[PDB]
Amino acid sequence: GIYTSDRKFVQIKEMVPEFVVPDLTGFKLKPYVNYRAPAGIDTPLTAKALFQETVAPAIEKDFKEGTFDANNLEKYGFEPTQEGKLFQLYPKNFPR
Amino acid sequence: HLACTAGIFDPYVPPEGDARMLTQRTERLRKNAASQLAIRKIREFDANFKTKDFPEKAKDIFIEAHLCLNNSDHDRLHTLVTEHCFPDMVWDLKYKTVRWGFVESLEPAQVVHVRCNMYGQVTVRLHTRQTLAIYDRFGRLMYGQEDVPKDVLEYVVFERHLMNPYGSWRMHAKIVPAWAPPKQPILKTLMIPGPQLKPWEEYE
């Protein structure tokens, strides 16, 4: 909130966080995992991996067809600006 | 790691009058039905274990272990006896000097009964005359006679770890027959304290 004149507290609804609680009904993931389940080797996701998985197939097909141009870079997923999104990648304007 | 298990798998029951008593050996022949299958299990790991010849090997360990007590050869006695047996033998002998000797055995030692991841216990019957004399820290004699032979019949149980490649026969426990006479009493006289009561309470 914000303290206005006269030493009076004025709570701001926007600045008050709202807890987004997921629905756990039908969700099969639980706090613990089976010892029967093999441990997973860590393979952290990277920009190259994300680009290869999603963006590369689109460009590869388009490039062979020849329908590739700078103006359509956004079509493959480029964002000219982070404004307009509730969650902005940079500068980070959203909380966890 | 445990190379021995406390207690006996099945307690053999000695018959009264066995000291007077071929004969008993045939009783084993009759009772190998109960014991031979056990004997086979020892034989499987060894194949040279025979009830007739075991007492000679067993007797040496028993006599040898007793000799270590006079010299306090704890390391030697450790090998001869199992972990369970050792503490009983020497715990009460602390700060004491004992002269122990073995007189000729009254009767030959014979295997009596055997039982058996796998621990095999063999009961051996031994009657032997021995001399015992224990002295105080100051050297004062407290128990036994220096050169008096005492005829005692007891059943001695040896044990071995069949599974272990280095397992060997070590003295584990002794079975005392009820008909055996009581041990000699201590030279000194003891006093039994009376009941303890609070100041309010009165004698009862």
Partner: protein, 176 residues
């Protein structure tokens, strides 16, 4: 629910509670973005219940049954956070190329050291912010003497380190 804050009534009085292994990072990566958010709360709920039980145990001066459960949940939660962070980090780099979510730059303090300065968001610009301008990002002339001392101190640290190793080496020769 209130019951969720506490362990199963059947489990009460048991020496331990049977629980499996914690979530590994790769399995969480296999799970969807929506699933990851759902799983985080599930782990958090278990963590709070275990924390709730542990605090009561402290009050009762009693041990916590199966303390490894809390460690497993925390490990799973830690794995979840990095997996989600990895996806967010990768996309930010792709769309913007910035290696850090928060704007920053290298700046010189009054002591002459070069340190990464994390930028702060303000409603006013820096030139109209006197307090931000009041903050000192410039090194005084006298810091030159300190800079020489820092280089000398670094050399001194190496010299002292060799002496420390030498004393250890003495016993190595004596022992062997």
């Amino acid at each position: 629910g209130l019951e969720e804050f506490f362990d199963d009534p059947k489990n009460w009085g048991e020496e331990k509670v049977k629980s499996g292994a914690s979530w590994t990072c790769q399995q969480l990566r296999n799970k969807s973005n929506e699933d990851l958010h759902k799983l985080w709360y599930v782990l958090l709920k278990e963590r709070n219940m275990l924390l709730t039980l542990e605090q009561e145990a402290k009050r009762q001066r009693l041990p916590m049954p199966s303390p490894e459960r809390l460690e497993k949940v925390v490990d799973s939660m830690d794995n979840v956070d990095k997996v989600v962070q990895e996806r967010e980090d990768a996309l930010r780099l792709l769309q913007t190329g910035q290696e850090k979510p928060r704007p920053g730059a290298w700046r010189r303090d009054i002591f002459g050291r070069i340190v990464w300065h994390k930028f702060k968001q303000w409603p006013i610009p820096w030139y109209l912010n006197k307090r931000y301008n009041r903050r000192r990002f410039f090194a005084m002339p006298y810091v030159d003497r300190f800079i020489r001392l820092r280089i000398e101190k670094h050399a001194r640290i190496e010299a002292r380190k060799r002496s420390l190793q030498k004393k250890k080496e003495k016993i190595l020769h004596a022992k062997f």
